[PDB]
């Protein structure tokens, strides 16, 4: 009762060549990496680091109010830490 044993057989090379976790069935057939000539631009046009801030978003879009609601939830949770019930 553990995870799959097959993990990074040739770590310096196979991981760079392609992904091995894509094959779920017992029939081993790993997919090719499909270099950048195949994947569209939205894959690279997204943030791959730390998220943005409420002081950086503009108060005319929807994600700004999403983050504001999330911060209000966090504030209410911090205030509700003295629940005696």
């Amino acid at each position: 009762e553990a995870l799959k044993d097959p993990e990074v057989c040739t770590d310096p090379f196979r991981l760079t060549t392609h992904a091995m976790g894509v094959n779920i069935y017992k029939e081993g057939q790993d997919v090719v990496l499909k270099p950048d000539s195949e994947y569209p631009e939205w894959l690279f046009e997204m943030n791959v680091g730390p998220p943005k801030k409420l002081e950086e978003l503009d108060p005319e879009t929807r994600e700004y109010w999403r983050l504001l609601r999330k911060h209000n939830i966090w504030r209410h949770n911090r205030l509700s830490k003295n629940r005696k019930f």
Partner: protein
């Protein structure tokens, strides 16, 4: 012979008690109680970014698309709600939900004041381009307790029977 500072409240002299009772505080009581007095002038409220975005979104909805159907949002399970979402996206007709506090004033200001009695309870706005009510009626027939209240198909407000006639047309 007690100390100057004690714990038993150090019961005072009778003259000191009289002096305290005389020098007690008296709050200012006006002639007319200002509570039920005619209220002060209105402190008018300002519009916020959220209500501005809601107004802009409702305007864009009512200007761009053609089929704007109004239905009663039935309290169903989230799995069934997402299944209905998928069955509507198959036909490429979306759903939206707007708060009454922002939808009633916009509708009573615009030309759609004939929809006021429809937005009393829960509401759901089915938005579609190139209206095709046949598939909508078919997909709402599969659910018994989800009735179509009404809506507008190209600036033509119709009831459930009107929608049925438009679908059979």
């Amino acid at each position: 012979g007690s100390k100057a500072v004690t714990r038993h409240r150090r019961v005072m002299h009778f003259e000191r008690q009289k002096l305290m009772a005389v020098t007690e505080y008296i709050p200012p009581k006006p002639t007319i109680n200002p509570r039920c007095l005619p209220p002060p002038p209105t402190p008018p409220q300002e519009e916020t970014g959220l209500v501005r975005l809601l107004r802009r979104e409702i305007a864009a909805v009512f200007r761009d698309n053609r089929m704007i159907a109004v239905c009663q949002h039935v309290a169903l399970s989230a799995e069934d709600k997402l299944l209905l979402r998928h069955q509507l996206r198959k036909h490429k007709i979306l759903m939206k939900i707007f708060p009454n506090q922002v939808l009633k004033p916009f509708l009573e200001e615009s030309k759609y004041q004939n929809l006021l009695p429809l937005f009393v309870g829960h509401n759901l706005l089915l938005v579609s381009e190139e209206p095709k009510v046949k598939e909508m009626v078919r997909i709402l027939k599969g659910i018994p307790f989800l009735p179509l209240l009404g809506g507008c198909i190209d600036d033509t407000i119709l009831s459930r029977q009107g929608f049925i006639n438009y679908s059979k047309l």
